[PDB]
Amino acid sequence: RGKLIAVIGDEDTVTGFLLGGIGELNKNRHPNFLVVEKDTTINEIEDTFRQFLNRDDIGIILINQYIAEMVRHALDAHQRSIPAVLEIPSKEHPYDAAKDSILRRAKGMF
Amino acid sequence: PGGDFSDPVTSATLGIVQVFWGLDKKLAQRKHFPSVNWLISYSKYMRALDEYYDKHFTEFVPLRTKAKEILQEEEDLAEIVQLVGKASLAETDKITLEVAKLIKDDFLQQNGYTPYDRFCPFYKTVGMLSNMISFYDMARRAVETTAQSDNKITWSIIREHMGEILYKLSSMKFKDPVKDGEAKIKADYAQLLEDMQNAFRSLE
Amino acid sequence: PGGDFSDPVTSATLGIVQVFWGLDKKLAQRKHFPSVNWLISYSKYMRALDEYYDKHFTEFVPLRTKAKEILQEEEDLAEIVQLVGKASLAETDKITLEVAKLIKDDFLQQNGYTPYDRFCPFYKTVGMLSNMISFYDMARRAVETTAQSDNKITWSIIREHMGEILYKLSSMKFKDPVKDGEAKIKADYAQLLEDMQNAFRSLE
Amino acid sequence: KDRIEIFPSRMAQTIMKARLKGAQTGRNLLKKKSDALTLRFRQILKKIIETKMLMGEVMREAAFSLAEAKFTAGDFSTTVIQNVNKAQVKIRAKKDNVAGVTLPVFEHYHEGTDSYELTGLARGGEQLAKLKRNYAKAVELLVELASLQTSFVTLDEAIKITNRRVNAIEHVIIPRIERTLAYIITELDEREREEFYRLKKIQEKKKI
């Protein structure tokens, strides 16, 4: 209806999810996703993550597993249900349950 | 002494009087007079008067019994909802709660300083109670039939379509016998019952 | 007999005396010498002595009133923090609770054998109360101004800001006035107020 | 604190026994709600791991489908990344009344503006179409996981507050009321015995 899924991913996953229909340019004419290449810094990535968090029109986010590891403290600094944040694997980093903030909230449930 | 049953005198008189008319302190603080408990009270004259009310009216006994059941179920649901903050009020619970709340507000308290309340005869009471049980019955039947079949009917559509019926039902209280005859008021009760029937048919 | 203040002798005594100093065994279990309750005690003679206390000081009434207010509000908040678990606290509430803790531990407590509080004259009492009330006022004003605009000051921030000043404030009571001069302690407490003002200006 | 402030009496005994009964019923009712909440927590966590493993392998499906799409077409990456105008998939937020507390959930929406058509990348449209299908199915399963995860995160604090309430009720008020009732029974006994003795002394005096 009004909220749009957003993707912070490397080039291949980003093409994959743009191909699945995920993607918009808002009235402000900006992408609702970010491209991750080899040459990026954790600090501006964290500021863009904050741009995502504070913006109201997202709901759910989709971040790779090593990309989510690269920003782990800032990622886990947020605890609110409405901005859902979900982790996905990648080609070279299959899924890892031991590395996940929400499954860390479920402490001792193993 | 103290407004309770501890004293020997109140115990002894309670143990030999046929009919007890316990009066609530809290309802006396609520100013919904007369402040009758309706729960700690009793009377051992139902059964004898059953024969009387069958010979003359043929309608009072089931209406009265249902009135007690609905009031009591409201009391029990009140005792339940205190903790959950009425969050778990379902549809049937809502109908029961509203029906008994209306019974409290319109037909369980009178104003002794006004012409339309200083005295209600038997037949007038029977008419109002018949009307109460009537709308309860029709509302419950409608919601049950629609929940079983399709397009469940909730209290929101009920309030929307038949606000006039409910207003008329609350305003039966003011059918002043002092300034009006018996024929007018009885025809009013019958015509409001038929209006409720017609409105429920419209919403069916 | 047993601390039960409803016993006959205390009941007869409370009606005749003018000043009453209720004492609490729980405090005496804490060794909170003197174990006075400070909430059920009273004294009808305050009105007759306000005139004297003005003809000598003129700067005690606000102190007393604010002390009563802070203690009363702490006692009210006691239940809310007991049930909740010290989470649902606006910053002013935490401020008053913790300043109440400081006044209770510092001004109210006093040892009755150690040389440095065998005796305590009135002026030191005035000095300590003025210090603590002024600190309360400055802390709340700073937190109000930083709350309305932005960057609401948490109590942890002021704690880490001036824990040393808090430590000096509490250790104020080590004086033994018998040896040291009165004006020396007055200048000492003025110096602590200067320290607090400097800290609040630097945070300002 | 340890005793509810009231004058002891028989009426008081009745009111305090009633208040104790009310507290007990409240405790039982809270226990039932906690049972339902932990049931919801367990059933939510039942197969989140399973569905997440399905997610991982489906992502790998889409991944090597992309690997094979890197073959026929070529350098499509920048062509796609530049062509970004509108979304064909959207979140239709719904509600889920799992218990007495309601948690938001989501729904998979096909908005309607079809996926765009790139027929020029050296004529490799078939691989792009199967890749579209793969990532569409993946995104469906992912919105399902997102709904589940949202409900889990809110239901955690819901359970915490309920458990705190029941614990505070069972370890504060009930002992207090019980001690108050013990004190009340003692006081009533005292008061009756005083009258007994004084009546006895009248009786003895009357013998003379």
From Swiss-Prot, chain A:
Primary localization class, coarse: membrane
Name of the protein in question: V-type proton ATPase subunit F
This protein's encoding gene: Atp6v1f
Keyword vocabulary terms for this entry: Cytoplasmic vesicle, Hydrogen ion transport, Ion transport, Membrane, Synapse, Transport
Taxonomic placement: Eukaryota, Metazoa, Chordata, Craniata, Vertebrata
InterPro entries: ATPase_V1-cplx_f_g_su, ATPase_V1-cplx_fsu_euk, ATPase_V1_fsu_sf
Function: Subunit of the V1 complex of vacuolar(H+)-ATPase (V-ATPase), a multisubunit enzyme composed of a peripheral complex (V1) that hydrolyzes ATP and a membrane integral complex (V0) that translocates protons. V-ATPase is responsible for acidifying and maintaining the pH of intracellular compartments and in some cell types, is targeted to the plasma membrane, where it is responsible for acidifying the extracellular environment.
Localization, UniProt: Cytoplasmic vesicle, Secretory vesicle, Synaptic vesicle membrane; Cytoplasmic vesicle, Clathrin-coated vesicle membrane
Membrane disposition: Peripheral membrane protein
Subunit description: V-ATPase is a heteromultimeric enzyme made up of two complexes: the ATP-hydrolytic V1 complex and the proton translocation V0 complex. The V1 complex consists of three catalytic AB heterodimers that form a heterohexamer, three peripheral stalks each consisting of EG heterodimers, one central rotor including subunits D and F, and the regulatory subunits C and H. The proton translocation complex V0 consists of the proton transport subunit a, a ring of proteolipid subunits c9c'', rotary subunit d, subunits e and f, and the accessory subunits ATP6AP1/Ac45 and ATP6AP2/PRR.
GO molecular function: proton-transporting ATPase activity, rotational mechanism
BP GO terms, sorted: synaptic vesicle lumen acidification
Family the entry assigns: Belongs to the V-ATPase F subunit family.
Swiss-Prot record, chains B, C:
Organism of this sequence: Mus musculus
Record localization: Cytoplasm; Cytoplasm, Cytosol; Cytoplasmic vesicle, Secretory vesicle; Cytoplasmic vesicle, Clathrin-coated vesicle membrane
Subunit relationships: V-ATPase is a heteromultimeric enzyme made up of two complexes: the ATP-hydrolytic V1 complex and the proton translocation V0 complex. The V1 complex consists of three catalytic AB heterodimers that form a heterohexamer, three peripheral stalks each consisting of EG heterodimers, one central rotor including subunits D and F, and the regulatory subunits C and H. The proton translocation complex V0 consists of the proton transport subunit a, a ring of proteolipid subunits c9c'', rotary subunit d, subunits e and f, and the accessory subunits ATP6AP1/Ac45 and ATP6AP2/PRR.
UniProt protein name: V-type proton ATPase catalytic subunit A
Similarity remark: Belongs to the ATPase alpha/beta chains family.
Known role: Catalytic subunit of the V1 complex of vacuolar(H+)-ATPase (V-ATPase), a multisubunit enzyme composed of a peripheral complex (V1) that hydrolyzes ATP and a membrane integral complex (V0) that translocates protons. V-ATPase is responsible for acidifying and maintaining the pH of intracellular compartments and in some cell types, is targeted to the plasma membrane, where it is responsible for acidifying the extracellular environment.
Disulphides: none
Section covered of the full-length record: 413 to 616 of 617
From Swiss-Prot, chain D:
Membrane topology: Peripheral membrane protein
Cellular component GO terms held in the UniProt record: ATPase complex; centrosome; cilium; clathrin-coated vesicle membrane; extrinsic component of synaptic vesicle membrane; nucleoplasm; plasma membrane; proton-transporting V-type ATPase complex
GO biological process: cilium assembly; protein localization to cilium; synaptic vesicle lumen acidification
Interval of the full protein contained in this chain: 4 to 211 of 247
MF-aspect GO terms: proton-transporting ATPase activity, rotational mechanism
Function text: Subunit of the V1 complex of vacuolar(H+)-ATPase (V-ATPase), a multisubunit enzyme composed of a peripheral complex (V1) that hydrolyzes ATP and a membrane integral complex (V0) that translocates protons. V-ATPase is responsible for acidifying and maintaining the pH of intracellular compartments and in some cell types, is targeted to the plasma membrane, where it is responsible for acidifying the extracellular environment. May play a role in cilium biogenesis through regulation of the transport and the localization of proteins to the cilium.
Chief localization: membrane
Family assignment from sequence similarity: Belongs to the V-ATPase D subunit family.
Keywords: Cell projection, Cilium biogenesis/degradation, Cytoplasm, Cytoplasmic vesicle, Cytoskeleton, Hydrogen ion transport, Ion transport, Membrane, Transport
Entry's localization field: Membrane; Cytoplasmic vesicle, Clathrin-coated vesicle membrane; Cytoplasm, Cytoskeleton, Microtubule organizing center, Centrosome; Cell projection, Cilium
Keyword Flavoprotein: no
Entry protein name: V-type proton ATPase subunit D
